[PDB]
Design an enzyme around this catalytic site. Structure first.
Site: not given
Ligand SMILES: C[S@@+](CC[C@H](N)C(=O)[O-])C[C@H]1O[C@@H](n2cnc3c(N)ncnc32)[C@H](O)[C@@H]1O
Ligand SMILES: CN1CCC(=C2c3ccccc3C=Cc3ccccc32)CC1
Length: 244
Positions: A182, A190
């Site tokens: 993120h 997306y």
């Molecule tokens: C959709 S996964 C992205 C890929 C993940 N980092 C992995 O190694 O598999 C989302 C997770 O990545 C981590 N993450 C995503 N964006 C982040 C951010 N800006 N700063 C710290 N952690 C982040 C968080 O743990 C989140 O639950």
């Molecule tokens: C790809 N997906 C990652 C999860 C996601 C989240 C989320 C879910 C669990 C923990 C943190 C997050 C972070 C941001 C978020 C914010 C609003 C709606 C859903 C999400 C939406 C986008």
């Protein structure tokens, strides 16, 4: 009467001759990826991929495509996920995706792995696919937020997820969209995608030109579903940039 092309809004397409009933059925049908070059060529029934071999759209003359098969034995079929089965071949990569993105340690501190571009490309380019299991909004919203890290809403009815142990590339690499971290200044979004293998899913699409080895990020946001500080930290910093 001759060759039919069906383009999806995402830029991909189905192409070939229809049968007597006007259906995309035969041994010489192709799905063509959004690059209008990478293709899955072979046996389709009513638009659905039965056996697509990797190919390149070499040229088109008056709407008639000329395909060359790629070397090797890469073969694909329509293989839509279910509530519990992510893929019949979790370790078979998507060939369009393989040419555009890779996974490595995120440049964002303490953010695990991230997704990076292999290539310099322009705005609105499809880079990666977000396939996963298909579950209800109730299941996602009714469980602990810490199980929802890889969730992405698909539509009114469905949420895509990449649950353990598929969150590890050694277990699942058919698609990689779930590896994008993120950001509040993302270079990607997306977007809806209709995939010949995965069916209806979402994809990662650049908002603007990106460089080779640039990390690809997307705005997740704005409160997490179910039931973090790293969000809160960057949210504030992003806000500060807007004022003196
Ligand atoms: C959709 S996964 C992205 C890929 C993940 N980092 C992995 O190694 O598999 C989302 C997770 O990545 C981590 N993450 C995503 N964006 C982040 C951010 N800006 N700063 C710290 N952690 C982040 C968080 O743990 C989140 O639950
Ligand atoms: C790809 N997906 C990652 C999860 C996601 C989240 C989320 C879910 C669990 C923990 C943190 C997050 C972070 C941001 C978020 C914010 C609003 C709606 C859903 C999400 C939406 C986008």
């Amino acid at each position: 009467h001759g060759v039919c092309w069906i383009y999806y809004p995402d830029g991909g397409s189905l192409v070939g001759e229809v049968n007597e009933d006007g259906e995309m059925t035969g041994e010489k049908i192709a799905y063509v990826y959004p690059d209008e070059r990478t293709a899955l060529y072979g046996k389709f029934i009513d638009g659905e991929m039965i056996e697509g071999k990797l190919a390149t759209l070499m040229s088109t003359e008056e709407g008639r495509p000329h395909f060359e098969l790629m070397p090797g034995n890469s073969v694909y079929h329509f293989d839509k996920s279910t509530s519990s089965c992510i893929s019949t071949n979790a370790l078979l990569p998507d060939p369009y995706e393989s040419e555009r993105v890779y996974v490595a340690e995120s440049l964002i501190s303490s953010a695990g792995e991230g997704l990076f571009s292999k290539v310099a490309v322009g705005p609105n380019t499809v880079m990666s696919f977000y396939n996963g299991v298909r579950i209800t909004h109730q299941e996602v919203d009714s469980r602990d937020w810490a199980l929802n890290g890889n969730t992405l809403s698909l539509d009114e009815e469905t949420v895509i997820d990449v649950p353990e142990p598929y969150n590890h590339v050694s277990k699942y690499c058919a698609s990689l969209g779930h590896k994008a971290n993120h950001s509040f200044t993302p270079n990607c979004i997306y977007d809806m995608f209709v995939h010949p293998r995965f069916g209806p899913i979402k994809c990662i699409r650049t908002l603007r030109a990106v460089e080779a080895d640039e990390e690809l990020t997307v705005a997740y946001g704005x409160x997490x579903x179910x039931x973090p500080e790293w969000y809160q930290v960057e949210l504030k910093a992003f806000q500060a940039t807007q004022q003196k």
